[PDB]
Amino acid sequence: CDTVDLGYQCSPATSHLWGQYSPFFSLEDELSVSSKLPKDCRITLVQVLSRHGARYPTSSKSKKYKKLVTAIQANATDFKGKFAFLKTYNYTLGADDLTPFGEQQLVNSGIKFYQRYKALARSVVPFIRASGSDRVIASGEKFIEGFQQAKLADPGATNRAAPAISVIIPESETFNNTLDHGVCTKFEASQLGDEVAANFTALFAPDIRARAEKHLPGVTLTDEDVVSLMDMCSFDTVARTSDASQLSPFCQLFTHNEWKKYNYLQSLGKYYGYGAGNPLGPAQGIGFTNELIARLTRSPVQDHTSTNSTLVSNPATFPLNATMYVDFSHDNSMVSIFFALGLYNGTEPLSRTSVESAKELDGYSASWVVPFGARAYFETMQCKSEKEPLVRALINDRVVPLHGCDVDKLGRCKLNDFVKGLSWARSGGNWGECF
Asked whether position 309 contacts ligand NAG by CB under 6 A, the answer is yes
CB of 370 to ligand NAG, least distance (A): 19
Q: Quick one: which segment of 94-102, 110-118, 365-373, 417-425 binds ligand NAG (CB under 6 A)?
A: 417-425
Q: Which of residues 25-54 bind ligand NAG (CB under 6 A)?
A: none
Asked whether position 308 contacts ligand NAG by CB under 6 A, the answer is yes
Asked whether position 70 contacts ligand NAG by CB under 6 A, the answer is no
CB of 24 to ligand NAG, least distance (A): 25
Say if residue 403 carries a ligand binding annotation.
no
Say if residue 97 carries a ligand binding annotation.
no
Say if residue 20 carries a ligand binding annotation.
yes
Say if residue 298 carries a ligand binding annotation.
no
Give CA torsion, residues 340, 404, 393, 243, to 10 deg: 40
Nearest Cα to Cα of residue 48 among 155, 174, 140 = 140
Total residue count of the chain as it appears in this document: 435
Nearest Cα to Cα of residue 90 among 249, 209, 251, 211 = 249
| Catalytic residue from among 16, 52, 181, 215 | 52
How many helices (H) does the chain have, and how many strands (E)? 15, 10
Among 27, 72, 86, 130, binds ligand NAG (CB under 6 A): 72
Say if residue 330 carries a ligand binding annotation.
yes
* CA 277 vs CA 185, 208, 287, 404: distances in Å: 18, 27, 19, 19
Asked whether position 175 contacts ligand NAG by CB under 6 A, the answer is yes
CB of 321 to ligand NAG, least distance (A): 4
Residues 182, 287: Cα–Cα separation, whole Å: 12
Say if residue 158 carries a ligand binding annotation.
no
For ligand NAG (CB under 6 A), the number of binding residues is: 34
Q: Where are the alpha helices (DSSP H) in 216-285?
A: 223-240, 256-273
Nearest Cα to Cα of residue 232 among 12, 18, 52, 7 = 18
CB contact set of 372 (below 8 Å; sequence gap of 6+): 20, 21, 22, 23, 24, 51, 52, 53, 54, 55, 102, 105, 238
CA atoms 298, 299, 300, 305: torsion sign: negative
Asked whether position 345 contacts ligand NAG by CB under 6 A, the answer is yes
CB contact set of 359 (below 8 Å; sequence gap of 6+): 31
Say if residue 115 carries a ligand binding annotation.
no
Among 111, 128, 183, 226, binds ligand NAG (CB under 6 A): 183
CB of 107 to ligand NAG, least distance (A): 23
Is 181 labeled as catalytic in the residue annotation?
no
Q: Quick one: which segment of 38-46, 98-106, 190-198, 239-247 binds ligand NAG (CB under 6 A)?
A: 190-198
Helix or strand (DSSP H, E) at 391: strand 390-395
Asked whether position 421 contacts ligand NAG by CB under 6 A, the answer is yes
Output DSSP code: residue 373: T
**Residue among 24 and 147 whose Cβ is closer to ligand NAG:** 147
Among 31, 120, 168, 320, binds ligand NAG (CB under 6 A): 320
Asked whether position 426 contacts ligand NAG by CB under 6 A, the answer is no
Among 176, 178, 201, 365, binds ligand NAG (CB under 6 A): 176
C-beta separation of 54 from 242 below 8 A: no
- Annotated binding-site residue numbers for 1D-myo-inositol hexakisphosphate: 20-21, 51-52, 55, 58, 135, 180, 270, 330-331
Catalytic residues: 52
